[model samples]
Target: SFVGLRVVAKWSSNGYFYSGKITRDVGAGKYKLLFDDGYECDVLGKDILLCDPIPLDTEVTALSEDEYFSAGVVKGHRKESGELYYSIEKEGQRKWYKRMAVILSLEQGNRLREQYGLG
Candidate 1:
């Protein structure tokens, strides 16, 4: 059986693409994906490469969570110590929404939806 090794998976959001590596394999169960930039996500299955893509916007039924892409306007908010926190703006307002292996949000879910011809 494969004991321990690092596996990197590549995925894209809109025009932005990112890669994540497998940190720990829980064997057929759930595992953790750690990105080079320090982002982490939970995944399942043994064949990580065959795992389905998690699209933006739509609610994650299996995971029971919702995700939204920030247009650099609203930023991203996450719970911290029971409080909410937002990401610092860096550049143009644009982001993609991927929720529960599906893209639920129409367009990129940003204020510039109309401006970007996404709406």
Candidate 2:
């Protein structure tokens, strides 16, 4: 019951990592979250660990969605506002995408195709 606490979750660990004071647990479903002053919240989010989030242009891939990334590059981020977005190059058309990781394991990147709306 980690309620009402500035909880930090792994909501992001790749495409673009982020952390903020956890606001509403959403009907206490224990599935969603609110962060970055509550401007960020989602149910597709996940675990969180304390570490220095990696930088941009760091190449990565989606952990589960092969349809999204066989390989991609992190172009930018906003640690304070959680505005981490990137672009993936396909056959010819360049696609823009949004992502939020704890960009944690950014030691390297994906799992962020849908997290930040890339459909």
Candidate 3:
């Protein structure tokens, strides 16, 4: 079933950024974001968004069943729709899974369009 996921868009020095949940089945491969606002971007990497500045253009692969880390952090995983899901972990315990928002920037968006031949 298609689940409702939170999405965020942002513009950065690297490129447009997007993070959210994958509702559909995204085969094991790389993917770009096709935003409802007509924006397209590649999946960079997973992040914690804690103290450090969010890493730019991070690459992520699938996780094994025994692997603790998937996509970005140990508590994160990707959905079939190419959306990334992350859970808050504390003291070796995982919290509830929450959909995150994708981030994008204007300059980044323009660059992505040009780089990916989308524009």
Candidate 4:
């Protein structure tokens, strides 16, 4: 996960998360990354979480139906566990489905017109 994207430590000595771009795959879940300030480090799993530059309100969702969706993206987060939430149509109405729920649905316009036929 931290192999290609930039990553930040949960907390850093510099008052910021340690950041770097993973530049090489060293095998066995380990990677070699290059930092902007002139340094490089080799890391393995659980040392840090993948630091992404995406915003939550920009449109997010998780799916339960798809195989391994939780591992596909941030289910939210946790000191222990978490996930992103969303709404969905179930049976004949709405329900709290985990995966496949649309947080900021990209298909909002299409769904509204198709479901409610409204402006």
Candidate 5:
């Protein structure tokens, strides 16, 4: 629904985030995405983030397998084994989560996680 709007979309095949624009809505929760490098594909709406990369030190929440959520400040991000992961620390315990598993805030995590059906 947001053509030409910049987004951070996940390439589901490898779960890597790519900077891109939404070219058009292809229906069924899918949209045509044109990556910054010129590669184009249709990605699921649930797989896209409206904003750019989250800034370091920003507060965030990470979701875990058991539906557990933890709030922390983003420490950093890195490519590990070809996947993008953000490092977050809460109460001195640091954890690395896949890009899709982290949301900008704790409340957003609860609402959006269910909206995306756990994404």
Candidate 6:
């Protein structure tokens, strides 16, 4: 029933979650996630959480794989491989990040930036 809705999923035991949408129901509790980074993988229902999309033009902090966070404005969204990826632009560079990467609160993002040593 979650197919086509935004979701957050733990892709592995590493404990970081990725944002993506359900692409297919592979049965036996397995569902395919097409990640915002254009990667696709199968995950169990236990590893997934339902989420809502961040509205376009909203200011957010987008996280990188290396744990860096930068402030940006959500420009647009694109669907590839049956999933949605958010378009965020920062300092003239626009990039796509997984849903989980787009932090909604600037205050929270500032805290994370400190934790990640971005400043």
Alpha-carbon lDDT, every model: 0.35, 0.41, 0.35, 0.39, 0.69, 0.67
lDDT of 4 by residue, 1-119 (tens): 33566543322233222345677778776667565444676655444435343222222333454532221223232222454233333334433443223222223212223322211
- TM-score top scorer: 6
Q: For every candidate structure, what is the RMSD over all alpha carbons to the true structure, in angstroms?
A: 13.2, 10.1, 13.5, 15.8, 8.4, 8.9
Q: Compared to the true structure, candidate 5 yields what TM-score? A: 0.50
Q: Could you tell me how far off, in angstroms, the CA of residue 99 lies in candidate 1 after the best superposition?
A: 25
lDDT of 3: 0.35
lDDT, candidate 3, at 11: 28
Which model is ahead, 2 or 5, in terms of lDDT? 5
lDDT of 1 by residue, 22-106 (tens): 6776654655667545777655432233212322232211211344333333344455565333332326543332211222132
Compared with the true structure, the alpha-carbon lDDT of candidate 1 equals: 0.35
lDDT by residue for model 2 (4-82), tens = 4433344443334344544445643443555553556554324432222333544554322333334555454443465
Which one wins by TM-score: 1 or 6?
A: 6
TM-score between candidate 1 and the true structure? 0.27
How big is the positional error of residue 96 in model 6, measured in Å on the Cα after superposition? 13
Clashing pairs in 5: none
Q: After best superposition, candidate 1 residue 110: deviation in angstroms?
A: 27
- List ranges where model 3 is wrong by over 4 Å: 1-77, 80-83, 86-100
Residue-level lDDT of model 6, residues 1-119, one tens digit each, is 77786765656645445567789889888889887778899887766656456556656767889878677888988888866679999888899886567754434323333322111
On lDDT, the candidate that comes out on top is 5
lDDT (C-alpha) at residue 58 in model 1 = 20
Candidate 1: RMSD over Cα atoms? 13.2
TM-score of each: 0.27, 0.30, 0.24, 0.35, 0.50, 0.50
Better of 3 and 6 by lDDT: 6
Error of 6 at 51 (Å): 1.4
